[PDB]
C-alpha cells in the first residue's frame, strides 16, 4: 500500500571549545535504516538494517560526502541564527531538520516534507503545495524572503518529487 | 539518499 521515507537531522553546538555535533537518521516505513554521527570514531553513514548491506562502497561513500557537506551547512547556519536572534556565542543551541516523502498505493507522491526548527521551536516549513513557506517569527521571514528570491522551494520539490520517491522504492526492493 | 540543505538562512 502506502510507504514513507523520512530523515531527521540534528546539529547541536558544543560547550565553549569544540565544534557542533551532527546526527542524521533515516527511516523507511518507520524503521531506522541508516545513521550518521559526527562524534563517531570516523564519521560515516552505517546500515541499521541487514538489507542495506547489499549496497556497494560507492553508495556509502557518496552519501557520506553529502553528510560532510551537510555538517558544514549546519555550522554556518547555526552561526547565522546566532546573528539573527542576537545571542552570545559559546552557548549551546540546536538545529533540527526533518524532510521526506509519503507515497501512496499507486507508487507516486502524496506528500512532501521539508522543515526546520531552532532550539525546539519551529523556524521555517515547506507547505503542502511544496511552493510556499510558513515562517514562525521575524527572522524566519528574513529567511523566507531569501528563499523566495533563491528558488529554494523548487530545489526541495525537485528532491521530494524525484529522488525521494525513487530511492524509497529502491530501498523497498531491497526487502 | 540524503538531501543537502543547500539554501542559506
Amino acid at each position: 500500500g502506502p510507504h514513507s521515507m523520512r530523515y531527521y537531522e540534528t546539529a547541536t553546538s558544543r560547550r565553549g571549545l569544540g565544534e557542533p555535533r551532527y546526527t542524521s537518521v533515516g527511516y523507511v516505513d518507520d524503521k531506522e535504516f541508516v545513521r550518521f554521527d559526527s562524534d563517531a570514531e570516523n564519521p560515516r553513514y552505517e546500515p541499521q538494517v541487514p538489507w542495506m548491506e547489499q549496497e556497494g562502497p560507492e553508495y556509502w561513500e557518496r552519501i557520506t560526502q553529502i553528510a560532510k557537506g551537510q555538517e558544514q551547512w549546519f555550522r554556518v547556519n547555526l552561526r547565522t541564527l546566532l546573528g539573527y536572534y542576537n545571542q552570545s556565542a559559546g552557548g549551546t543551541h540546536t538545529l533540527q531538520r526533518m524532510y521526506g516523502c509519503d507515497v501512496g498505493s499507486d507508487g507516486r507522491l502524496l506528500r512532501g516534507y521539508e522543515q526546520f526548527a531552532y532550539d525546539g521551536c519551529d523556524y521555517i516549513a515547506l507547505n503542502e503545495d511544496l511552493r510556499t513557506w510558513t515562517a514562525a517569527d521575524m527572522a524566519a521571514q528574513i529567511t523566507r524572503r531569501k528563499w523566495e528570491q533563491a528558488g529554494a522551494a523548487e530545489y526541495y520539490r525537485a528532491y521530494l518529487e524525484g529522488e525521494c520517491v525513487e530511492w524509497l522504492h529502491r530501498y523497498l526492493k531491497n526487502g | 539518499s540524503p538531501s543537502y540543505a543547500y539554501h542559506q538562512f
Partner: T-cell receptor
C-alpha cells in the same frame, strides 16, 4: 563590494608578501584564487567565517587569515618566482554566486 | 563533481554562440553556474540553473533533460562578449578551482 590591496606588487624572492581582501557584502564564505595562463583560476584557500580556514587545491607556500567577517588575508612568507600570478579574492553567501575582487598582480623576481 | 568544456571557441560578431558544458556525474544537490571573465578582470556571475532552462538579460541557459550537459547561449555576440566563460557545479559545500573554462573570441 570586494576590495583588494595592493593592486600591484613586485618583490624579490624570499621576501614576505601580504595580500588584503575586504568584503562589505555580509557574506560568510571568502576565497583566494590565483590566475595563470594554461591553468585558469585555481583555489588556494577559503573560509566560511571569522577564524575559519580551509585548504584549497593549490595551497603550498600560502597561509591565510580570516580575522573578521569582512577581512581575509593571503600570506606568502617566503615568496618564490612560481608565485608570480594574478590573485583574486571572492566572497559568497554559502553556495550561491561568488563576487570577485579587482585583482592583485604579483611579480616575484629572483 | 567536475565540469568539462572545450577550452576555446571562435565566433564572429552577430552570431549566436552555443557554449557546451559536460557534467555527467552531477547530482540533485548541485546547481549549474556560469561565470564570465573579460580580460584583466575577475569572473562575474552570468547565470545558473537546476533543471529547467533559464533566461536573463545576459544569456540563455539550456539544461539537458537528464542534467548531464548544459549550453550557455549568447545572442548576437559583440566584441565585448569575448571572455573566458566558466561552467562549474555549486553545492554540497564543495569549494573547488574554477579551472580553465572556455575562451570565447569574437572577430569583427
Amino acid at each position: 563590494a570586494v576590495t583588494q590591496s595592493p593592486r600591484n606588487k613586485v618583490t624579490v624572492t624570499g621576501g614576505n608578501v601580504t595580500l588584503s581582501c575586504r568584503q562589505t557584502n555580509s557574506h560568510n564564505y571568502m576565497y583566494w584564487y590565483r590566475q595563470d595562463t594554461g591553468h585558469g583560476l585555481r583555489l588556494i584557500h577559503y573560509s566560511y567565517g571569522a577564524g575559519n580556514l580551509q585548504i584549497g587545491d593549490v595551497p603550498d607556500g600560502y597561509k591565510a587569515t580570516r580575522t573578521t567577517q569582512e577581512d581575509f588575508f593571503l600570506l606568502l612568507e617566503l615568496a618564490s618566482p612560481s608565485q608570480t600570478s594574478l590573485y583574486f579574492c571572492a566572497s559568497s553567501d554559502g553556495d550561491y554566486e561568488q563576487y570577485f575582487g579587482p585583482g592583485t598582480r604579483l611579480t616575484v623576481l629572483e | 563533481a567536475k565540469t568539462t568544456q572545450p577550452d576555446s571557441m571562435e565566433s564572429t560578431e552577430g552570431e549566436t554562440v552555443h557554449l557546451p558544458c559536460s557534467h555527467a556525474t552531477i547530482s540533485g544537490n548541485e546547481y549549474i553556474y556560469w561565470y564570465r571573465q573579460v580580460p584583466l578582470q575577475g569572473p562575474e556571475y552570468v547565470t545558473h540553473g537546476l533543471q529547467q532552462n533559464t533566461t536573463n538579460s545576459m544569456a540563455f541557459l539550456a539544461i539537458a533533460s537528464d542534467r548531464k550537459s548544459s549550453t550557455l547561449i549568447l545572442t548576437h555576440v559583440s566584441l565585448r562578449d569575448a571572455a573566458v566563460y566558466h561552467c562549474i557545479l555549486q553545492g554540497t559545500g564543495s569549494k573547488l578551482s574554477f579551472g580553465k573554462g572556455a575562451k570565447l573570441t569574437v572577430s569583427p
